């Protein structure tokens, strides 16, 4: 996923910052297995 490329590399901060220039997302984090960039 976005930034979250697996449990060996969780870029919570490319995840938080794909979502966070897009109005609608205040942030995000690696949710599922370090692969899914879950944003809110």
Swiss-Prot record:
Biological process, per Gene Ontology: defense response to bacterium
Consequence the record notes for mutating residue 12 to A/C/E/F/G/H/I/K/L/M/N/P/Q/R/S/T/V/W/Y: Complete loss of antibacterial activity
Positions with a binding annotation for beta-D-GlcNAc-(1->4)-Mur2Ac(oyl-L-Ala-gamma-D-Glu-L-Lys-D-Ala-D-Ala)-di-trans,octa-cis-undecaprenyl diphosphate: 2-4, 12, 18, 29, 31, 33, 37-38
Record's keyword terms, sorted: Antibiotic, Antimicrobial, Cleavage on pair of basic residues, Defensin, Disulfide bond, Host cell membrane, Host membrane, Ion channel impairing toxin, Membrane, Pharmaceutical, Potassium channel impairing toxin, Secreted, Signal, Toxin, Voltage-gated potassium channel impairing toxin
Consequence of changing residue 38 to R: No change of antibacterial activity
Effect of residue 29 to A/C/D/E/F/G/H/I/K/L/M/N/P/Q/R/S/T/V/W: Complete loss of antibacterial activity
The UniProt record lists the keyword Signal: yes
A molecular function (GO) term: potassium channel regulator activity
Main location: secreted
Disulfide bridges in this chain: 4-30, 15-37, 19-39
Region (Binds to membrane interface), start-end ranges: 6-9, 31-37
Localisation per UniProt entry: Secreted; Host cell membrane
A cellular component term, taken from the record's GO annotations: extracellular region
Domain of life: Eukaryota
Primary role: Antimicrobial peptide that potently acts against several species of Gram-positive bacteria. It selectively inhibits peptidoglycan biosynthesis through complex formation with the cell wall precursor lipid II (1:1 molar ratio) thus inhibiting cell wall synthesis. It does not disrupt cell membranes. Is especially active against numerous clinical isolates of S.pneumoniae, including all 90 different serotypes and isolates resistant to clinically used antibiotics. In vitro, shows considerable selectivity for bacteria over mammalian cells.
Family: Belongs to the invertebrate defensin family. Type 2 subfamily.
Note: In mice infected by S.pneumoniae, it has an efficacy comparable to vancomycin in the peritoneal model and to penicillin in the pneumonia model.
Protein name: Fungal defensin plectasin
Organism: Pseudoplectania nigrella (Ebony cup)
Portion held of the full protein: 56 to 95 of 95
């Amino acid at each position: 996923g976005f930034g979250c490329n697996g449990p060996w590399n969780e870029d919570d901060x490319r995840c938080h910052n794909h979502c966070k220039s897009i109005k609608g997302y205040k942030g995000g984090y690696c949710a599922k297995g370090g692969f899914v960039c879950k944003c809110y």
